[PDB]
């Protein structure tokens, strides 16, 4: 009987391809296959995901070229990834992470082929500039439900699964399909790579910002500072006096003096200080 602690370690490559494909495919419930591997009874390793040329209808999608897929499989065996199918994924742009009826049927087929297949869902609409809305799934056996058996033995505390979503519950979560825990593992190369991605070049690292633009920038910032000081003086002219405590934040829903003052003073700190430092450092380092 399957275990609760089952994990799916998805390669960063796989995640990026999934998300890019789905974001391209919005709103179409675009679909793709992935090659991974079943290392053991507690883990599934997902390596790569490649899409499907099919472009069906604005409510549904369909497999077009089994020949396409078989050829991709053979060739990737030749070079690329000698993995072989472990599941499939499709975007649900703005629905959560639940499986429609057709989704469940496709799965049923996948499991019939390989009892431990996996389905995957991604929400490029919802996946934020930060956390990413994704999940994995495997069906629930109606035979087990009728017999009273249970999906997985939870020989762990890895069954919290971060508060299964109400939407997934509604659409059928844990009554026909159950979530699984995703993870990201890096063999240090992609890891330090990821680190490199944002890192910028010493070109700029030493490139002092032009100084005429900087002088004008300071001029503008000091002007807006003067005005913010005026309105701040007016605001403090009463502040607690005349007791806006009941007014609280609702004293005015606009134009807080202090917050703007601190924001702009901080930014002009940054600008002026670092530019002066770069000036000093260059003057002295190029000799």
């Amino acid at each position: 009987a399957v275990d609760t602690a089952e994990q799916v370690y998805i390669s960063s490559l796989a995640l990026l391809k999934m998300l890019k494909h789905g974001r391209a495919g919005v709103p179409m419930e675009v679909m793709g296959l992935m090659l991974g591997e079943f290392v053991d009874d507690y883990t599934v390793r997902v390596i790569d995901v490649f899409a499907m040329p099919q472009s069906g209808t604005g409510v549904s999608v369909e497999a077009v070229d089994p020949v396409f897929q078989a050829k991709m499989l053979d060739m990737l065996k030749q070079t690329g990834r000698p993995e072989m199918v472990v599941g499939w994924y499709h975007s649900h742009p703005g629905f959560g992470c639940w499986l429609s009826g057709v989704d469940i049927n496709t799965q049923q087929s996948f499991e019939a082929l390989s009892e431990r297949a996996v389905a995957v869902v991604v929400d490029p609409i919802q996946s934020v500039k930060g956390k990413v809305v994704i999940d994995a799934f495997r069906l629930i056996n109606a035979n087990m439900m009728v017999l009273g058996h249970e999906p997985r033995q939870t020989t762990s505390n890895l069954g919290h699964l971060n508060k299964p979503s109400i939407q997934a519950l509604i659409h059928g979560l844990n009554r026909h399909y159950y979530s699984i825990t995703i993870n990201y593992r890096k063999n240090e190369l992609e890891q330090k790579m990821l680190l490199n991605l944002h890192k910028k070049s010493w070109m700029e690292g030493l490139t002092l910002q032009d100084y005429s633009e900087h002088c004008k920038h300071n001029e503008s910032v000091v002007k807006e500072m003067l005005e913010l000081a005026k309105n701040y003086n007016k605001a403090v002219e009463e502040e607690d006096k005349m007791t806006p405590e009941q007014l609280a934040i609702k004293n005015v829903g606009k134009q807080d003096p202090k917050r703007h003052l601190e924001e702009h003073v901080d930014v002009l700190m940054t600008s002026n200080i670092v530019q002066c430092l770069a000036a000093m450092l260059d003057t002295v380092v190029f000799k």
Binding site: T57, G58, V59, S60
Partner: peptide, 29 residues
């Protein structure tokens, strides 16, 4: 009448399949 019956059946198949495909395309707003 083999060829004629086959042709008529094929025409029916074509129209029926096209109608089913047509039935599966919701509208927009």
């Amino acid at each position: 009448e083999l060829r004629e019956q086959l042709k008529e059946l094929t025409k029916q198949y074509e129209k029926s399949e096209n109608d089913l495909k047509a039935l599966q395309s919701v509208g927009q707003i």
